[PDB]
Coordinates of N, CA and C in Angstrom, one line a residue:
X19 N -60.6 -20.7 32.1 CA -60.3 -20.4 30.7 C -59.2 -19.4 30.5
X20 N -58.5 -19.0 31.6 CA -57.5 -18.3 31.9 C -56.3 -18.6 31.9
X21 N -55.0 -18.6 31.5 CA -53.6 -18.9 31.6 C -53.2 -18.2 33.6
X22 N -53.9 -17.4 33.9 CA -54.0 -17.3 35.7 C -54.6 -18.1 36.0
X23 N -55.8 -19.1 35.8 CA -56.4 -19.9 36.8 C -55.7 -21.1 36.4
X24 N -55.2 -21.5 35.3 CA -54.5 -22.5 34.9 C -53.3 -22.7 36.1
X25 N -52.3 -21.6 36.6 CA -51.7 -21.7 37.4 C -51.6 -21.9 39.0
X26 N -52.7 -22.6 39.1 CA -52.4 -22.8 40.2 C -53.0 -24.4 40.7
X27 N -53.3 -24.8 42.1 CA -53.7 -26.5 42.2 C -54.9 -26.7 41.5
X28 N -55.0 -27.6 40.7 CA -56.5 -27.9 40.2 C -57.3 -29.3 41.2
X29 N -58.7 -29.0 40.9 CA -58.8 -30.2 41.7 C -59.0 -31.6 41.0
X30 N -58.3 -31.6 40.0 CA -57.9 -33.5 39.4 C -56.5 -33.2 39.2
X31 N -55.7 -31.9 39.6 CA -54.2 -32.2 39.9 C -53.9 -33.0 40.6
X32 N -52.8 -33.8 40.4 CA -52.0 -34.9 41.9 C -51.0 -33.8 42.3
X33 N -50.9 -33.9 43.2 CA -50.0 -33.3 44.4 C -49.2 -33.7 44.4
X34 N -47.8 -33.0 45.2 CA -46.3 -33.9 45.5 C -46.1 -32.5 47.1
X35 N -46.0 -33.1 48.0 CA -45.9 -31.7 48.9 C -47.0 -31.6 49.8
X36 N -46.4 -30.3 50.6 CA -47.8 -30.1 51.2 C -48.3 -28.9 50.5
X37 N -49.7 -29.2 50.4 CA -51.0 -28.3 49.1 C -50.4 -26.4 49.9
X38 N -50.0 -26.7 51.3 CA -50.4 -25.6 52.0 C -48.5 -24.8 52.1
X39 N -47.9 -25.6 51.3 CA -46.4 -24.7 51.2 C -46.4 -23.6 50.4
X40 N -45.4 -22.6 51.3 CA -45.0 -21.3 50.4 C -45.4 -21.3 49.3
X41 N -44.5 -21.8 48.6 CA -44.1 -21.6 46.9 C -44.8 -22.9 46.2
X42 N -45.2 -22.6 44.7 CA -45.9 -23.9 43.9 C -44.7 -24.0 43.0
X43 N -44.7 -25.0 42.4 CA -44.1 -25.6 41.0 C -45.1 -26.4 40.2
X44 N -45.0 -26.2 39.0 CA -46.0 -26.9 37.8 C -45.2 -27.4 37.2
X45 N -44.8 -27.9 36.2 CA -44.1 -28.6 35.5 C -44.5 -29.7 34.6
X46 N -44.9 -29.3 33.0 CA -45.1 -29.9 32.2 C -44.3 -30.7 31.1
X47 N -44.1 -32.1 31.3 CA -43.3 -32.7 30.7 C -43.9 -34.2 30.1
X48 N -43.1 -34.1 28.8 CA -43.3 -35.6 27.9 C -42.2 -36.9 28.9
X49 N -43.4 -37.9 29.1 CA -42.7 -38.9 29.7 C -41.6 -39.8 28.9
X50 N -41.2 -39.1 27.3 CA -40.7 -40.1 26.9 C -39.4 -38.5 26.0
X51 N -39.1 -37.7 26.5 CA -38.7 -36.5 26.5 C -36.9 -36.9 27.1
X52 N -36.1 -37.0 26.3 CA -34.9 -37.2 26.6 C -34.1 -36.6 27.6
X53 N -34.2 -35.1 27.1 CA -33.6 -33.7 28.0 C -34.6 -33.7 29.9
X54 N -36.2 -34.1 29.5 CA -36.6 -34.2 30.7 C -36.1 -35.4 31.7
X55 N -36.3 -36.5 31.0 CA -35.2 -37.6 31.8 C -33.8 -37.5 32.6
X56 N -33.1 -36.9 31.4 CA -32.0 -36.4 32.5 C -31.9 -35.3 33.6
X57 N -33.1 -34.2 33.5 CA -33.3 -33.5 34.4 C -34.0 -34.2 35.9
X58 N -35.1 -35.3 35.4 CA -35.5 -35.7 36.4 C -34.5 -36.9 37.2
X59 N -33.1 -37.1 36.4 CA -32.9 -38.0 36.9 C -31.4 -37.7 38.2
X60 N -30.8 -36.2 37.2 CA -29.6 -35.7 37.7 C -30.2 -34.6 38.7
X61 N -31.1 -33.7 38.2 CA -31.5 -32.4 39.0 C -32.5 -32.9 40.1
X62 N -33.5 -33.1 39.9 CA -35.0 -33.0 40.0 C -34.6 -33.8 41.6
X63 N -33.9 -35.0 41.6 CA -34.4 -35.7 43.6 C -34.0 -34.4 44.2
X64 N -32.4 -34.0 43.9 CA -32.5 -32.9 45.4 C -33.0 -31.7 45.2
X65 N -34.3 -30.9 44.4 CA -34.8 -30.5 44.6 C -36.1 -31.0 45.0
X66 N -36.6 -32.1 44.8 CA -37.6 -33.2 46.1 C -36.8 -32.9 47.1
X67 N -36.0 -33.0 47.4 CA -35.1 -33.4 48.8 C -35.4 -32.2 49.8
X68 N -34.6 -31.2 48.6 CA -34.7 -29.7 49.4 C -35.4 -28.8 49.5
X69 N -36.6 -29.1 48.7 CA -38.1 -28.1 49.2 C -38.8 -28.7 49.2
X70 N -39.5 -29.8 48.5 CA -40.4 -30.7 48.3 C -40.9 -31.4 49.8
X71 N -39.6 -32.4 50.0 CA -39.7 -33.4 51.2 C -39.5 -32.0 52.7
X72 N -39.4 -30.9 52.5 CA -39.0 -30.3 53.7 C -40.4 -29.1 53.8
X73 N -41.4 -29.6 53.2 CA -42.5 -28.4 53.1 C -42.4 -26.9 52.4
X74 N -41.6 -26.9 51.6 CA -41.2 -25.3 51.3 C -42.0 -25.6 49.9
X75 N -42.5 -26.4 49.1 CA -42.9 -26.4 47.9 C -43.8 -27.3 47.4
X76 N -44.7 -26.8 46.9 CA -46.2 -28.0 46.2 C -45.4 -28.5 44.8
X77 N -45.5 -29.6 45.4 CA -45.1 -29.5 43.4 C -46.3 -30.3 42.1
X78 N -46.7 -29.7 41.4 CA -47.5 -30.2 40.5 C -47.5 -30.5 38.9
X79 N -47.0 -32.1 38.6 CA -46.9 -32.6 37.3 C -47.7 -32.5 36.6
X80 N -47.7 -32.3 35.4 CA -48.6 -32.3 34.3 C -48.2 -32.8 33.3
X81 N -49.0 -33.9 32.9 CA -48.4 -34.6 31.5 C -49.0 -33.8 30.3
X82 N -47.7 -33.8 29.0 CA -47.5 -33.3 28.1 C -47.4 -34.2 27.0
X83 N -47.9 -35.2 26.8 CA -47.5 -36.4 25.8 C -47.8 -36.2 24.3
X84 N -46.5 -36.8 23.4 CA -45.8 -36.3 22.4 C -46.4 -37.7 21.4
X85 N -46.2 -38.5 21.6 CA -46.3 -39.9 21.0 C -47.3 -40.9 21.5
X86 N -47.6 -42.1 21.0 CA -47.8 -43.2 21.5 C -47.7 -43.8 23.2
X87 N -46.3 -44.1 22.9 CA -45.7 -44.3 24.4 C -45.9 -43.2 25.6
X88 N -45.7 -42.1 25.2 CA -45.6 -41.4 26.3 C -47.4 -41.2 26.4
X89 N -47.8 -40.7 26.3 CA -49.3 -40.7 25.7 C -49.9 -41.7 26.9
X90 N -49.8 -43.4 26.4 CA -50.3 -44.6 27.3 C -49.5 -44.7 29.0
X91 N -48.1 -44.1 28.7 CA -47.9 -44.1 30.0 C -48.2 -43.2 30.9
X92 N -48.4 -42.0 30.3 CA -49.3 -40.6 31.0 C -50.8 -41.5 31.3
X93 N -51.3 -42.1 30.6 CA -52.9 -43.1 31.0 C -52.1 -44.0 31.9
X94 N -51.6 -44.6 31.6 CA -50.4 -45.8 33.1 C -50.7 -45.2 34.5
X95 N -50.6 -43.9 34.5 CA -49.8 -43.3 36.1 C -50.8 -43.3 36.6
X96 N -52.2 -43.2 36.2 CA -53.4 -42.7 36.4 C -54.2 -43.9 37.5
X97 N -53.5 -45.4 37.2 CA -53.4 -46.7 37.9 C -52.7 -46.5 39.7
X98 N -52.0 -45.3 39.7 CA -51.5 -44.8 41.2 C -52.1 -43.8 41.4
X99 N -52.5 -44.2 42.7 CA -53.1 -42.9 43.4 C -52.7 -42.4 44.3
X100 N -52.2 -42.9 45.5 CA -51.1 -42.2 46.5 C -50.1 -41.2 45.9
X101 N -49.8 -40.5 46.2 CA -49.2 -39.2 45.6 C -47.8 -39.3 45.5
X102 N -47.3 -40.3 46.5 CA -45.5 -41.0 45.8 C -45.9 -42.3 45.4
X103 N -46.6 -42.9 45.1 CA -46.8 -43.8 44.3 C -47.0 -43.3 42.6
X104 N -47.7 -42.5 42.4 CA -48.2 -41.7 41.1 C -46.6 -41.0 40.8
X105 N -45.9 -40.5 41.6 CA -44.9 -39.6 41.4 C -43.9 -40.8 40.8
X106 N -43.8 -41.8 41.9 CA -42.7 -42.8 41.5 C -42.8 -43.5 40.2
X107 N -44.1 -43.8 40.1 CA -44.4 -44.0 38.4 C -43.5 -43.7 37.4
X108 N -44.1 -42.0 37.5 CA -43.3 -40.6 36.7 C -41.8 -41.2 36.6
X109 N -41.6 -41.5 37.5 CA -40.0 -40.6 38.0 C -39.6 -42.2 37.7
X110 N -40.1 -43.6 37.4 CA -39.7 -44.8 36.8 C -39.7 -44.6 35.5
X111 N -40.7 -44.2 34.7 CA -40.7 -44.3 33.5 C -39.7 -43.2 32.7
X112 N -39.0 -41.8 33.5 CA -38.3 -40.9 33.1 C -36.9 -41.7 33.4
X113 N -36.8 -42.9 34.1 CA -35.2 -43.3 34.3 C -35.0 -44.5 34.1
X114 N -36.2 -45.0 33.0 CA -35.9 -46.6 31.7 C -36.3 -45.9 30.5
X115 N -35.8 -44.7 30.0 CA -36.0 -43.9 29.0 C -35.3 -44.6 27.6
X116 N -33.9 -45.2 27.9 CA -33.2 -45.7 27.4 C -33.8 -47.8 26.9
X117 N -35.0 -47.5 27.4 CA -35.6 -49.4 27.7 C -36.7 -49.6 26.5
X118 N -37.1 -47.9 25.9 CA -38.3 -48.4 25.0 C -37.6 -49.2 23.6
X119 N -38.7 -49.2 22.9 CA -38.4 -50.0 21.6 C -38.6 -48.9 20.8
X120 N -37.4 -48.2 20.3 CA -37.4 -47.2 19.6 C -37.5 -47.4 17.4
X121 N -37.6 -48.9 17.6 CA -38.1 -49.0 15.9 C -39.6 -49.5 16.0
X122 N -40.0 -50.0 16.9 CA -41.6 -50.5 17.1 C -42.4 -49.5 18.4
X123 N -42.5 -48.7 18.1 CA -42.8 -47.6 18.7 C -44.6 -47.7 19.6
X124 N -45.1 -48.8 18.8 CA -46.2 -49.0 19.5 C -46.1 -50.6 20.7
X125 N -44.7 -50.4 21.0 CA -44.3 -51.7 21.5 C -44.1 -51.1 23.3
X126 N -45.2 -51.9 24.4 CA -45.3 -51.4 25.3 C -44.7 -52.2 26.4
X127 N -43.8 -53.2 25.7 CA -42.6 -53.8 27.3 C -42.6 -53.1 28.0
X128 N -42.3 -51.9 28.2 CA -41.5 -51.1 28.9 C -42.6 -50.8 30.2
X129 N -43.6 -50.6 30.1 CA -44.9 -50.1 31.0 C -45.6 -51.4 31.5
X130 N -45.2 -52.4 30.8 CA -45.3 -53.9 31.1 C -44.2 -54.2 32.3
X131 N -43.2 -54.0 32.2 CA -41.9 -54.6 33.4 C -42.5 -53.3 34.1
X132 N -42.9 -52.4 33.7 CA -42.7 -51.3 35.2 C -44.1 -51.6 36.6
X133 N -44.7 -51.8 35.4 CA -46.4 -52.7 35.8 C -45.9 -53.6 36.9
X134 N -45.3 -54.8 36.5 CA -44.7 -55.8 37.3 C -44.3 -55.2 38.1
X135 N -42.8 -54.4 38.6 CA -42.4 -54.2 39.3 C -43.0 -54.0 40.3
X136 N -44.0 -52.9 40.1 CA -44.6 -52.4 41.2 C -46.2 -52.9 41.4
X137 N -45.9 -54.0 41.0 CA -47.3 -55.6 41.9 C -48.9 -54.7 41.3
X138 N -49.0 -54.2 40.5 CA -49.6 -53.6 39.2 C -50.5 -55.2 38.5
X139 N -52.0 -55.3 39.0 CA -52.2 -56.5 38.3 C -52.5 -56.2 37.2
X140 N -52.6 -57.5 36.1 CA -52.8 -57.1 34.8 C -54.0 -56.6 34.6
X141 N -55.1 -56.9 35.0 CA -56.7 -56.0 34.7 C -56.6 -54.6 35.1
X142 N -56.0 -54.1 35.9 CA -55.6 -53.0 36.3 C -54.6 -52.0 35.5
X143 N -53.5 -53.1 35.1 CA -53.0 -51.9 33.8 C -53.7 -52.2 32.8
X144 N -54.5 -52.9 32.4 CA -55.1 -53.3 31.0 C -56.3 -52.0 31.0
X145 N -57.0 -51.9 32.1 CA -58.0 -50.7 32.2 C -57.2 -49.9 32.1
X146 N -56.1 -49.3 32.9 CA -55.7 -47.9 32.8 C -55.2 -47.8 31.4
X147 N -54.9 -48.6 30.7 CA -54.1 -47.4 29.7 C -55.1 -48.4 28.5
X148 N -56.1 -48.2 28.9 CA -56.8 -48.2 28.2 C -58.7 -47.9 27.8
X149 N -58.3 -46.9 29.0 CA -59.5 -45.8 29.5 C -59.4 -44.6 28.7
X150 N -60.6 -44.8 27.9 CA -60.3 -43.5 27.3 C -61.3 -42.1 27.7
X151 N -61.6 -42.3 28.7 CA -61.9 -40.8 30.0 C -60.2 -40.1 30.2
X152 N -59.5 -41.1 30.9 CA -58.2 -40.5 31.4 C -57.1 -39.8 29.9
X153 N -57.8 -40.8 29.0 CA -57.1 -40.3 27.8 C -57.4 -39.4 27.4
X154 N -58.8 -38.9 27.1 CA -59.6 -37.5 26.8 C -58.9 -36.4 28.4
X155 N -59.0 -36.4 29.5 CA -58.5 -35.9 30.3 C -57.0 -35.3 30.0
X156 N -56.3 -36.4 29.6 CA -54.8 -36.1 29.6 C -54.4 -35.0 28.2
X157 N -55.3 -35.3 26.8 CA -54.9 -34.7 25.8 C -55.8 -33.4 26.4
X158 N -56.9 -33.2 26.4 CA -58.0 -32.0 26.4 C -56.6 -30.8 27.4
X159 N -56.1 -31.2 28.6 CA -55.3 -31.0 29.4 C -54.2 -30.2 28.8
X160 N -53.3 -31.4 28.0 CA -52.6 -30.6 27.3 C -52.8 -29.4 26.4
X161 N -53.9 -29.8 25.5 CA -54.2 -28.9 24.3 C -54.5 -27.1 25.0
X162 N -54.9 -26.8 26.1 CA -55.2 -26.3 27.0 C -54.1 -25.7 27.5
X163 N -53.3 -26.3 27.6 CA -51.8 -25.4 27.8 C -51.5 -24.7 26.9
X164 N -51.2 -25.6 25.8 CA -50.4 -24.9 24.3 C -51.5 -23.9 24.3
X165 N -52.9 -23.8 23.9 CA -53.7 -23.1 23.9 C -53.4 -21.5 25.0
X166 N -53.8 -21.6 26.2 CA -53.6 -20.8 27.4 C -52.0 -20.3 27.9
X167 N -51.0 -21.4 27.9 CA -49.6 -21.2 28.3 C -48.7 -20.9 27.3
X168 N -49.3 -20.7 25.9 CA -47.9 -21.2 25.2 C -47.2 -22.2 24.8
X169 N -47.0 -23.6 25.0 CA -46.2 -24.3 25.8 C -46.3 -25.2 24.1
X170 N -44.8 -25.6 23.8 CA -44.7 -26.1 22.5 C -43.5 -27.4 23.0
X171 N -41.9 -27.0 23.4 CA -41.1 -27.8 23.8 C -41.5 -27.9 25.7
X172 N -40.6 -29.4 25.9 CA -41.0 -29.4 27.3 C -39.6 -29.8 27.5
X173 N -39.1 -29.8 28.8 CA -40.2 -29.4 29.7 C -40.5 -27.7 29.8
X174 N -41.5 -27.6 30.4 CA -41.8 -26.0 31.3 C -41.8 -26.3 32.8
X175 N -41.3 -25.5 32.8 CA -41.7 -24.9 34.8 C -42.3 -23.3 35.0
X176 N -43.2 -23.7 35.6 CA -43.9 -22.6 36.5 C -43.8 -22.2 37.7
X177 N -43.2 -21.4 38.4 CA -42.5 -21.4 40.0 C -42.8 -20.4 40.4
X178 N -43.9 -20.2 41.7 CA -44.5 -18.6 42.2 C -44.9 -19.2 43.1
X179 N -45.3 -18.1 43.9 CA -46.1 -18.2 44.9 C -47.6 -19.1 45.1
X180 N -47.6 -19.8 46.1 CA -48.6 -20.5 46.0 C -49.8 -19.9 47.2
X181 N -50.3 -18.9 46.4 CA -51.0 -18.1 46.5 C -52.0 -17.7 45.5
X182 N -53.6 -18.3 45.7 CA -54.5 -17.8 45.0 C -54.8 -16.6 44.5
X183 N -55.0 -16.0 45.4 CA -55.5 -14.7 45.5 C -54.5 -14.0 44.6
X184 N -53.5 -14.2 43.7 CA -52.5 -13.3 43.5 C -52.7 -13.7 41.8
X185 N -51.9 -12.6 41.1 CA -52.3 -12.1 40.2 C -50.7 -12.0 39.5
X186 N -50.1 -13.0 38.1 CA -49.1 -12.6 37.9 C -49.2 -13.4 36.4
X187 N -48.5 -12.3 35.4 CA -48.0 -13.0 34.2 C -47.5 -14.2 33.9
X188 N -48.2 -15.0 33.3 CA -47.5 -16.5 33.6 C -46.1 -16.6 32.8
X189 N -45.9 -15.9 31.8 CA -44.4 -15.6 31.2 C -43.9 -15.2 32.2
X190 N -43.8 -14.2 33.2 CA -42.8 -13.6 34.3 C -42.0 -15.2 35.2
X191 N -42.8 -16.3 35.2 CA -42.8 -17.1 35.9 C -42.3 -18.4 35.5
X192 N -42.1 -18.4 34.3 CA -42.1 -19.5 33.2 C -40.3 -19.7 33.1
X193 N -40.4 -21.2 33.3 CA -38.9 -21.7 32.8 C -38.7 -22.6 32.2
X194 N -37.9 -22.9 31.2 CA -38.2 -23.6 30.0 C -37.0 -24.8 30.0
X195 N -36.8 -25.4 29.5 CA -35.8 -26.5 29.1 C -35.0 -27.0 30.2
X196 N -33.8 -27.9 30.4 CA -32.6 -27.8 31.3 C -32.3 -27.3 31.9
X197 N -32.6 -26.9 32.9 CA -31.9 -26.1 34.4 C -31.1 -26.8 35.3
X198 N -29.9 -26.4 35.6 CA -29.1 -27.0 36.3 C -29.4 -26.7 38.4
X199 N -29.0 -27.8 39.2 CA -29.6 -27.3 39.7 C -29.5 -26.3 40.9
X200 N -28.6 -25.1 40.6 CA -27.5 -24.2 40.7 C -29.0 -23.0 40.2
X201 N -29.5 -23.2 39.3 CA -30.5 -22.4 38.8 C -31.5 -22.2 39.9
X202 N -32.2 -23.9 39.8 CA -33.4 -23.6 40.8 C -33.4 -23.0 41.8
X203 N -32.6 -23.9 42.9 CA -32.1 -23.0 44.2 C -32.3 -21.7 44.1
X204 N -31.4 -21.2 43.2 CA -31.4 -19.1 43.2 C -33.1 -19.2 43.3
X205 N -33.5 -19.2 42.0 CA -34.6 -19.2 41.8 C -35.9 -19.5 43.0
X206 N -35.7 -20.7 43.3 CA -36.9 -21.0 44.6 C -36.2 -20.1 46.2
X207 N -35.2 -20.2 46.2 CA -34.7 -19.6 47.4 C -35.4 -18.3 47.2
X208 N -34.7 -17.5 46.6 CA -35.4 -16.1 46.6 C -36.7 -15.9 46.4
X209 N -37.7 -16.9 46.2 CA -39.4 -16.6 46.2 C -39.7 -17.3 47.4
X210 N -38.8 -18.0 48.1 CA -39.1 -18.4 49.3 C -39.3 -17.1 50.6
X211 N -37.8 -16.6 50.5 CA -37.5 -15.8 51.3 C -38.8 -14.7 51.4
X212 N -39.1 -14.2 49.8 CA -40.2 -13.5 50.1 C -41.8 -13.7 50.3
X213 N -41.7 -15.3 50.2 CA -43.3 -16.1 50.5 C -42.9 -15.9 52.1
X214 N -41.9 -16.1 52.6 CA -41.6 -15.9 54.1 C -41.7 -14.6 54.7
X215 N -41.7 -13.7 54.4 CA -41.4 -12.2 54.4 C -43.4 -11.8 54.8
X216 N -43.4 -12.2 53.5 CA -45.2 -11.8 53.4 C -46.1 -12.7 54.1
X217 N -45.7 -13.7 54.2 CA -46.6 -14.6 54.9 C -46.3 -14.1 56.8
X218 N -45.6 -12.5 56.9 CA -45.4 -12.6 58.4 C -44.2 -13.7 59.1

């Protein structure tokens, strides 16, 4: 019930990383979020590349869903369970941003071809995004943020130590909108160096 315990792995979080790297990342974003699309599509691989894929960083998504679409496709991802399967989802539906049907808004082609793509049978998307456990999961989740974090525009990032035991302002930690990724780097390098320092 804390904005501290909030920050850190939960256990119905999906993972991206190893659980047991230095530094965490949280990162709550609307899958249907324009500014987050282009971050996930220009910034976001090579920082997977360069801490993610190299063990320096847990990273942990959190859906934030705004509308309809983003809403069912946040219930969509819930159909992957492998932890780059679930991520690839994400990271498909943030780079056909440009594919929904922006005047029939309850119009779900878009989660339909991504279904296909990835050999997704239809009883299987037909349940997921249309479980309403994962749906109560995903809003209760959100509301919980705004509630405990603050959290109004997305995306947010949260970037600290991934370390339980520790005790830190979640504002001290918090980053908000578009970051280029000239930002991160500074940013993760320098909590690296000192996750490295203290960890001996």
């Amino acid at each position: 019930i804390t904005s501290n315990e909030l920050l850190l792995p939960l256990p119905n979080d999906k993972l991206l990383g190893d659980p047991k790297a230095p530094i965490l990342m949280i990162e709550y974003a609307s899958l249907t979020c324009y500014h987050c699309s282009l971050f996930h599509r220009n910034v976001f691989p090579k920082i997977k590349e360069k801490y993610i894929d190299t063990g320096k960083m847990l990273y942990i998504f959190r859906h934030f869903p705004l509308d309809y679409r983003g809403l069912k496709a946040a219930m969509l991802s819930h159909a992957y369970e492998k932890q780059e399967d679930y991520f690839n989802f994400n990271k498909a539906v943030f780079n056909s941003i440009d594919s929904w049907n922006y005047y029939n808004l309850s119009d779900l082609t878009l989660l339909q071809r991504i279904a296909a793509l990835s050999n997704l049978k239809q009883d299987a998307f037909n349940q997921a995004i249309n479980d309403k456990k994962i749906m109560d999961k995903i809003v209760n989740d959100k509301s919980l943020a705004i509630n405990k974090l603050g959290i109004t525009a997305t995306p947010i990032f949260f970037i600290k130590l991934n370390d339980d035991k520790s005790y830190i302002e979640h504002n001290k930690v918090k980053h908000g909108g578009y970051k280029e990724l000239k930002y991160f780097t500074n940013v993760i390098d320098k909590l690296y160096g000192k996750a490295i320092v203290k960890l001996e």
